[PDB]
Amino acid sequence: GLNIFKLTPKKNCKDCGFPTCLAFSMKVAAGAVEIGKCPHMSDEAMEKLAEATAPIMKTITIGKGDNEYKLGGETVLFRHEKTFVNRNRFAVAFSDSMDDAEVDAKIQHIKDVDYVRIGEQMKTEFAAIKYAGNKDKYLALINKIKASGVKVAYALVCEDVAVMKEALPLVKDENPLVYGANKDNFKEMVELVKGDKLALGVKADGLEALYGLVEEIQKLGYKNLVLDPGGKSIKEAFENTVQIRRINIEGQDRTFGYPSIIFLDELTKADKFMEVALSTLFTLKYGSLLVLSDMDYSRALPLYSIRQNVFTDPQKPMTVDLGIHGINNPDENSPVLCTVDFALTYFLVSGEVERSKVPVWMVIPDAGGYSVLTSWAAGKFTGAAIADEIKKCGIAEKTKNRTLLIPGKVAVLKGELEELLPDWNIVISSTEAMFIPKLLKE
Amino acid sequence: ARNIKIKITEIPIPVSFAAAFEGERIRKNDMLAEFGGNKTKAWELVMCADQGEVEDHKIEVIGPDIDTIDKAPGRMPLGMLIKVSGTNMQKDFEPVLERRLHYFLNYIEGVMHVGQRNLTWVRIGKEAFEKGFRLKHFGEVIYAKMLDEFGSVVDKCEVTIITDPGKAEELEGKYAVPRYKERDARLESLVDEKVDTFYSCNLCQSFAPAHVCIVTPERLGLCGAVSWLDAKATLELNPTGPCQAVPKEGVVDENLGIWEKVNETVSKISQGAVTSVTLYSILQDPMTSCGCFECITGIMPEANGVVMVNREFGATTPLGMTFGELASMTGGGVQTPGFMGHGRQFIASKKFMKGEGGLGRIVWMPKELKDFVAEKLNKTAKELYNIDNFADMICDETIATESEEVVKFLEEKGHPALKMDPIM
Amino acid sequence: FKKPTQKFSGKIGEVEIGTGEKALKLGGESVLPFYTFDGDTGNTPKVGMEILDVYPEDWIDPLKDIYKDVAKDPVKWAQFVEEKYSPDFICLRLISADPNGTDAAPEDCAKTAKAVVEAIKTPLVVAGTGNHEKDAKLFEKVAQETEGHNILLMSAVEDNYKSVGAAGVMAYNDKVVAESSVDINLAKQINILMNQLGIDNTKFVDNVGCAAGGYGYEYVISTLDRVKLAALGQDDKTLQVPIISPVSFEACKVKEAMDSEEDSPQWGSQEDRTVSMEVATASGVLASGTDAVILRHPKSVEVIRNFIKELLG
Amino acid sequence: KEAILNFKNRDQSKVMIPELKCKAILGYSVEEIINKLDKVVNTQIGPMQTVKPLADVLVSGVLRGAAAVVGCNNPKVVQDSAHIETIKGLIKNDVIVVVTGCAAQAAAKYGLLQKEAAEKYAGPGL
Ligand code: B12
Numbered sequence A: 001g002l003n004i005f006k007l008t009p010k011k012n013c014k015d016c017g018f019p020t021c022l023a024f025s026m027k028v029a030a031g032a033v034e035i036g037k038c039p040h041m042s043d044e045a046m047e048k049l050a051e052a053t054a055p056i057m058k059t060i061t062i063g064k065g066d067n068e069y070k071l072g073g074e075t076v077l078f079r080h081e082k083t084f085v086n087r088n089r090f091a092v093a094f095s096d097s098m099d100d101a102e103v104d105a106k107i108q109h110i111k112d113v114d115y116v117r118i119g120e121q122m123k124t125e126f127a128a129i130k131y132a133g134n135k136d137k138y139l140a141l142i143n144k145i146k147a148s149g150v151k152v153a154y155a156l157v158c159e160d161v162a163v164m165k166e167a168l169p170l171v172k173d174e175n176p177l178v179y180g181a182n183k184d185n186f187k188e189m190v191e192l193v194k195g196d197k198l199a200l201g202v203k204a205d206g207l208e209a210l211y212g213l214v215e216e217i218q219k220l221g222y223k224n225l226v227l228d229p230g231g232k233s234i235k236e237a238f239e240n241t242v243q244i245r246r247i248n249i250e251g252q253d254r255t256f257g258y259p260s261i262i263f264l265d266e267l268t269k270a271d272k273f274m275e276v277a278l279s280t281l282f283t284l285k286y287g288s289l290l291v292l293s294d295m296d297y298s299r300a301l302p303l304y305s306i307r308q309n310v311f312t313d314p315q316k317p318m319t320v321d322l323g324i325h326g327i328n329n330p331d332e333n334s335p336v337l338c339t340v341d342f343a344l345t346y347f348l349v350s351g352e353v354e355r356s357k358v359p360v361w362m363v364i365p366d367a368g369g370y371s372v373l374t375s376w377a378a379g380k381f382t383g384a385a386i387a388d389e390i391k392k393c394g395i396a397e398k399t400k401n402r403t404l405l406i407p408g409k410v411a412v413l414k415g416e417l418e419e420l421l422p423d424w425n426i427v428i429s430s431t432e433a434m435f436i437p438k439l440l441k442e
Numbered sequence B: 001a002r003n004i005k006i007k008i009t010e011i012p013i014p015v016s017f018a019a020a021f022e023g024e025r026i027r028k029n030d031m032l033a034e035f036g037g038n039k040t041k042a043w044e045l046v047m048c049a050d051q052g053e054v055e056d057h058k059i060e061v062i063g064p065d066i067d068t069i070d071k072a073p074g075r076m077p078l079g080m081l082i083k084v085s086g087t088n089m090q091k092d093f094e095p096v097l098e099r100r101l102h103y104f105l106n107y108i109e110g111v112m113h114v115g116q117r118n119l120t121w122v123r124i125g126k127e128a129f130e131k132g133f134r135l136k137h138f139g140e141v142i143y144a145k146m147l148d149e150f151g152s153v154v155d156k157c158e159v160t161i162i163t164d165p166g167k168a169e170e171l172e173g174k175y176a177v178p179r180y181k182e183r184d185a186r187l188e189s190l191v192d193e194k195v196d197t198f199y200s201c202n203l204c205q206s207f208a209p210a211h212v213c214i215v216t217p218e219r220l221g222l223c224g225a226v227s228w229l230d231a232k233a234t235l236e237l238n239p240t241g242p243c244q245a246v247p248k249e250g251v252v253d254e255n256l257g258i259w260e261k262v263n264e265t266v267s268k269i270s271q272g273a274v275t276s277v278t279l280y281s282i283l284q285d286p287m288t289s290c291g292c293f294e295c296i297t298g299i300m301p302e303a304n305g306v307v308m309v310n311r312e313f314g315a316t317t318p319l320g321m322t323f324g325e326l327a328s329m330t331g332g333g334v335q336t337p338g339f340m341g342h343g344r345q346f347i348a349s350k351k352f353m354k355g356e357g358g359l360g361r362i363v364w365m366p367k368e369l370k371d372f373v374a375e376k377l378n379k380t381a382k383e384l385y386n387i388d389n390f391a392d393m394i395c396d397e398t399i400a401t402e403s404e405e406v407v408k409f410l411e412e413k414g415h416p417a418l419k420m421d422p423i424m
Numbered sequence C: 001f002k003k004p005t006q007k008f009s010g011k012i013g014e015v016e017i018g019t020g021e022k023a024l025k026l027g028g029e030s031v032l033p034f035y036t037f038d039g040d041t042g043n044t045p046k047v048g049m050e051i052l053d054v055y056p057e058d059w060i061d062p063l064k065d066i067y068k069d070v071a072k073d074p075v076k077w078a079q080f081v082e083e084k085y086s087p088d089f090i091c092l093r094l095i096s097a098d099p100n101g102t103d104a105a106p107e108d109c110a111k112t113a114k115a116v117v118e119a120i121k122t123p124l125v126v127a128g129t130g131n132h133e134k135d136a137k138l139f140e141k142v143a144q145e146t147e148g149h150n151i152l153l154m155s156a157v158e159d160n161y162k163s164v165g166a167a168g169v170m171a172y173n174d175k176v177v178a179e180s181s182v183d184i185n186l187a188k189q190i191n192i193l194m195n196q197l198g199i200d201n202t203k204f205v206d207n208v209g210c211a212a213g214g215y216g217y218e219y220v221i222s223t224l225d226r227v228k229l230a231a232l233g234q235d236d237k238t239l240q241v242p243i244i245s246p247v248s249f250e251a252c253k254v255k256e257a258m259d260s261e262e263d264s265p266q267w268g269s270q271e272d273r274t275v276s277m278e279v280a281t282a283s284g285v286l287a288s289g290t291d292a293v294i295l296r297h298p299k300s301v302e303v304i305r306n307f308i309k310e311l312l313g
Numbered sequence D: 001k002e003a004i005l006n007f008k009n010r011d012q013s014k015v016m017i018p019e020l021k022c023k024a025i026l027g028y029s030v031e032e033i034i035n036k037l038d039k040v041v042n043t044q045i046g047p048m049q050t051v052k053p054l055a056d057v058l059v060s061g062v063l064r065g066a067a068a069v070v071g072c073n074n075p076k077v078v079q080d081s082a083h084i085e086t087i088k089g090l091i092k093n094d095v096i097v098v099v100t101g102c103a104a105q106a107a108a109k110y111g112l113l114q115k116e117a118a119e120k121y122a123g124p125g126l
């Protein structure tokens, strides 16, 4: 970033929303903001820094405000090297040849599978509507999905340009993914898709053919592309995906710098457990949009949890909100518990309390996102912090029940907590969360 | 003759001994005995001695014991002289072992001891007295824990507890204060050129996969809790631990702090993520930072200098970023030229930014941090030949925070950084 | 464009578990998992089945229905598992030695392990409890009784690495698992301690920690990635040992798998959720660099074996 | 100060310093030797601060004897040749060698005043 700082006007005019040119240079160095934000940049420096700063992998935005999803923007091959930026999305595959009962069942499955895990809403993102040969039934299917009310983004999978020219205006205003560009129709697809700046799906036979097709499409002047790795088998598809990502990153080649779409329903032949295995594989192996034959809770529970874990920033652990977290509606005569702001620890303790089916007032002090032991070591989950959080949160609503449960890891805090909370009854609990229910039954 | 050591199964004390007993607060009216603090003179000392001078497992109590107390409180001097003998025992290991005393005593329920050296006070409740606790059990516990924890560096341990008013002060003057003064003198007089090996710590690689800390006498571990002597003690006590010796061989640049052996060690420890480092520079292959650093130093080009910010500072900085943004940009084990994460003891070091003219480039610093650092900073800048109070040339957040105002202040005050060569 | 030619100087060592025609080999690869387009993958990752030395009372209803007439006798349970499902190996977990639970003497568990190891031909993995002090004595007696079968002993942590290493590799010619808690540096430290003790890389495997999907899973994934990159890319000799992951130990214990359909009607079939959790955790750890996975449900073993065959074949 | 001021008269074009230096360890007074011998004294036996360990190794025959190598150089002998050959022969025969003066300096230049020299030149007992 200091390098781009040399090219900056150094006026510190605050016209870009950043107080100093160094701040702007560091913001564009991280890739958060493009360089076009500076009005006073010299033209030549702009023309050079456009190429110098351009990300090695392009981010593609699909969907409207509620269903907006970004795919791409990756910089490393392993999450420990640097965070993984944009998480993969899931599509449910509807087909023209499918009967009404199956379509209704899949619509209901998409609608029902929707929950929240640690503040994030897990639900199906995309509806991949494929063309099987009947244009009228395909239009009827896409209209039916649009009329059902499911909150999903649209991905039209149609090889025929003639059918797509009629299918696109039905969902054109929703910013869909247009798929079906080949070596013999990419000319007819770019002109159809470049007007509204919609994402264009590119497919071919093999990495070399795909590379040539993408080169031709880029020569046409279109960069809002989503690549489809080929492969007649699971092994070939895995090889193609891995090689596309490694060429983009290790090779520093921007021809393959686009998110990949993988049709897992076709590779797995509609096998639920094989779909789960391949989805877990491609969550870690550069698959950006995974298409599945169906979506239920058996699929969603592992896949969404693993996706939430993997695409967590290594330097920014997930945290829960602070203050009072009422569990099991714990009004009047309920034990008070305290734990650490860590998302994982809070999830574990909340699940254990829910299993016990007993009211509990849980108070979450500020801890820096560290765990029980390492937050005390850092100096956040101290007795003073717990006492201050108890004083300020508003736990004084209760009158009689005054037991305050403390993690067994921090046993030193008992004296300090009793000193700072003479009224409260500090009770050191066990060392593990499995214990929570049996000690609370006591 | 066979170097055979027999380990003690349990501590011979009536009072139960467990690690969960730390931090217990025990009532004032139950305080049978209280030594140290503003009331009495108490001290502790762990000193290396030759095998002849210390006899193994000899607990000597001199003066009245706690039994003689017949009033609700107790008030008598307490002096704990611990002599340790061993083949690998060194004076530099004395400050480490002594620290563990704080912990070794706190694991005993009924007694609470806190403090450093002669600043320690110990409070013993009457429940331990009823159980049968005496002053000899202090020696029993200290001997057992010294032979447990430091059994690889300590062969014999002798603990003497002194309660007489005369012998407690006589032994403190003869033994305690000279040890403290020589320890402080060694801490202050150690420089990079005097030593022949640095140390490398990778304890923060659990969250910063590429970070390697290079600890030198004049460059502290940026967590602030690891020093050169601490690294040496950790390497001796835990050879397979995070602190490993780095020979200072194959010098390339003495001013910028470039060594071929240091580069090789950093490359190996970081698993090849970091290739070349410079110890004394922030613009040429700087050292990485993890995220435990107390202070962040960032280059200010318009001032031709550097600004600093601690984690307790929440307002903006002349760089235009807060501490959170600087920490996000700097930490994570990534080499970011122009930004550095470091501790509070590294500011007033003669190796601080030695590759860019030294610490004379510090132009902005928070007011509380400036007040904390001023004495040592002024000493080092006087080594630079600057004025008696160099910290006055350093701008504060109250004086000026906008970059233009900071430069105006520097021009008014004649800050030396404005008269140096360009920083980058 | 240039094909990505990722050449690694390092190579994972091979460790052999079991005796006879059923003995398996772990490790031997010089590329990332399933990277058949980059070079040589040494041995196919192995899938083992978990059984208990006592009746499984906390297991889900379908699992107890599968082993209704064999779970009471560990010998019969192991024979049934080897006959009907024929896994790569069987992990006998000595739950009865848990000090928290119905604590049992090491002699009883050693006798059970000896009875089991003389009835099956597949390699056996004997896993202890979470208590290090109990584990040391238990593995002493287990390795003494099960001599001559080249079993694998799990959870040789730094606290008791000397005891399990001596009673295992050194005395009775067994293999051991050096376990470290989700840290590359801790894995290096335990490997270096084992090497300094007198145990080379051909005589133990590594356990860098395991976790269910969504419960500290990214730490396991990052540890596996870092260990694999250091062992292969950086040619780090202290990490060139195969990795074994017990997946069913944590995957089947989570709420997403344990809860029945009565507790969470919207979630659906309990068996499907259990199998899905096992499959997801196993697939992730296999893709990140593990060499053997322990599973519980037979359907999970079938799915994971098919997954491995599809990726490698 | 006279020596320092003469540095201005240095002619660097006439300077040739061979890059040949050798590490040496010295300082073995009788007191230092006794302090070193204290390491091999069993504490439960003693006594400390005596030459008794040296007397023991000499009496037992682990060391055959002790030899002092002293004296100057002489143009009649190839310089340092006799010192080095005598010292190497003696230590190879498990005779511990004490050196003084120009002989000691010949040993220092050659590299015999090193701990490593024990495994390079000495016999088994020494
Ligand atoms: C993971 C980890 C890290 C990760 C944490 C990841 C994260 N995002 O939180 C990171 C790398 C950040 C970390 C850092 C450090 N760590 Co650390 N860390 C650990 C580790 C491996 C486990 C902690 C953990 O994740 N636990 C799981 C979480 C989900 O559970 P938990 O919060 O511990 O709570 C458990 C119970 O208490 C219970 N529970 C919680 N609340 C309640 C309430 C009640 C009523 C009940 C009944 C139960 C209960 O629930 C959990 C069980 O399910 C331990 C190893 C060990 N031996 O414990 C070391 C360890 C705790 N770390 C340690 C240290 C010292 C540090 C550092 C200070 C130095 C270092 N590098 O080692 C740094 C931090 C530097 C700083 N000051 O900024 C030490 C702690 C020693 C001490 N002083 O106590 C350990 C033991 C390692 C070591 N030996 O050096 N660490």
Ligand code: SF4
Pocket (backbone or CB within 6 Å): A008, A009, A010, A011, A012, A013, A014, A015, A016, A017, A018, A019, A020, A021, A024, A025, A037, A038, A039, A040, A041
């Ligand atoms: S608009 Fe450009 S010159 Fe003005 S403050 Fe922002 S980065 Fe600096």
Ligand code: SF4
Pocket (backbone or CB within 6 Å): B201, B202, B203, B204, B205, B212, B213, B214, B215, B221, B222, B223, B224, B225, B226, B242, B290, B292
């Ligand atoms: S910051 Fe401290 S603990 Fe972390 S690696 Fe550096 S010296 Fe070690």
Ligand code: NI
Pocket (backbone or CB within 6 Å): B204, B222, B223, B290, B291, B292, B293
């Ligand atoms: Ni650190």
Ligand code: NI
Pocket (backbone or CB within 6 Å): B204, B223, B289, B290, B291, B292, B293, B331
């Ligand atoms: Ni840090």
